[PDB]
Design a protein around this ligand. Structure first.
Ligand SMILES: [Zn+2]
Length: 27
């Protein structure tokens, strides 16, 4: 299995904390 990548977008986060902002920052 690979790290934790997002659903729609070529990016990855190390902790849900940052992965969350990514969603609130999606657009
Ligand atoms: Zn995303």
């Amino acid at each position: 299995e690979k790290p934790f990548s997002c659903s729609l977008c070529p990016q990855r986060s190390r902790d849900f904390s940052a992965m969350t902002k990514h969603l609130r920052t999606h657009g």
